[PDB]
Symmetry: C2
Subunit: 265 residues, 2 copies
């Protein structure tokens, strides 16, 4: 046999860096920000593999593989902040951090996949992230963060508790157990979360219709962001948790429907 192999030109698995929790492999993913990138990859039907990184190791892994910090000063007033998601794409040798920069890279590098963040979305999506921070993220924080924290592996649980209580504990009542304890405090915070999702639903129905996605019939990155936060809540709380089952009935079922979309990527 004078036969030898010729190289394949199939797209190689992108290296996707994700934060595990204390579960077996198939239920290990949970994080809302890394879910943005995982959903972008699967929507584009790009191949990937997951490398698990615990919270206290993220900076050293990022420096090892050449990922830039995602911002400067979220925890330390004068120090860069390294976060996941990160991808290293061996097809090009490029490492990218921050889910928006990853989305742009994937649009640019794989133009035959469905585009997620065209230039005409960039400013309005930036507006959305700031509106979302105030009307969803901050009301959701006292729910998602205390639920996820004890699910983490011990090294991540300690880091996550210390940094998140360190950041927002003082305006949520102290330690996580006092942020939304079952009873009137949780109920008051729950009403605020429900009100935020209804305000966001109101954005989507502003024209008196019920478009499925912000642009109309076509999904884009900002739908993926909303879907990533919802998938995180569902994965952390559990699909039969009564509080998740309430969310499924919020705003005419709009968030159930979006979850069904992104789950079927």
């Amino acid at each position: 046999s004078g036969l030898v192999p010729r190289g394949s030109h199939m797209i190689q698995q992108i290296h996707f860096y994700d934060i595990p929790r204390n579960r077996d492999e198939d239920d290990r993913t949970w994080n809302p920000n890394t879910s943005k990138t995982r959903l972008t990859l699967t929507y584009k039907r790009l191949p990937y593999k997951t490398i698990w990184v615990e919270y206290p190791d993220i900076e050293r892994v990022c420096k090892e593989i050449g990922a830039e910090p995602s911002a400067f000063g979220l925890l330390k007033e004068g120090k860069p902040y390294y976060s996941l998601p990160v991808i290293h794409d061996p097809n090009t040798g490029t490492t990218i951090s921050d889910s928006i920069r990853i989305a742009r890279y994937l649009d640019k590098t794989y133009p035959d996949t469905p585009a997620v963040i065209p230039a005409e979305l960039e400013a309005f999506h930036a507006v959305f992230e700031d509106a979302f921070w105030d009307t969803i993220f901050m009301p959701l924080f006292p729910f998602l963060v205390p639920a996820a924290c004890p699910q983490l592996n011990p090294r991540s649980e300690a880091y996550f508790r210390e940094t998140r209580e360190g950041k927002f504990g003082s305006i949520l009542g102290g330690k996580m157990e006092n942020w939304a304890p079952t009873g009137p405090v949780r109920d008051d915070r729950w009403k605020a979360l429900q009100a935020g999702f209804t305000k966001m639903a109101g954005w989507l129905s502003a024209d008196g219709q019920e478009r499925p996605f912000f642009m109309g019939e076509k999904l884009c990155y900002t739908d993926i962001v909303v879907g990533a936060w919802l998938i995180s809540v569902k994965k952390v709380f559990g699909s039969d948790h009564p509080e998740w089952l309430q969310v499924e009935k919020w705003d005419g079922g709009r968030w159930s429907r979006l979850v069904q979309v992104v789950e079927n990527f």
Copy 2:
């Protein structure tokens, strides 16, 4: 292209005709009309007469419960278009009406913008309107005609006075309180400029090269501040330099419609 003038309902202030307009919300519609090059005449309505004027001409209320819980809320701007016999309230609904009725004018609110512009109005509310309120409202109030001054002061102090120090004079008095609030306002404009520069470039309008209704909204708020404070006021002169001159450039655009 020969039409009758559109009737534009606007709120005066205590000045002669050519300087009577000032309001940020009615400026949204005035700018939309001028951008589309549609002829209009202005009918002046003082704040306490807006409801009865709206009911007389058939204008819908623009919100429900903003002043008292179970009570429709009427506001200006309103247009009545005699070319169709239609009266329209709320500047977003007026912009949609003008887009659809005059399709050969530049579209300002296409369907693909509607959700993102609604997002923007809420982000703008927190980022710009709230820090702007203690400056614009106390500056505008004494410029109003007496019947509007009393109404404006009573309604705006009743709604925001408790969280701002009570009477308007306590909202941003010259001294450290005004300094703190003025820095907060500049911080909000920088956040809004950061939206426009989010991709690392410096697009002139939210969508890129093409202006849309949400640029008109920001320009309407800027023109209101400039008209109220005065074009030589040292606080307005600072706004012209904020964020590398972005807001002075936008003002130049909308003034040039």
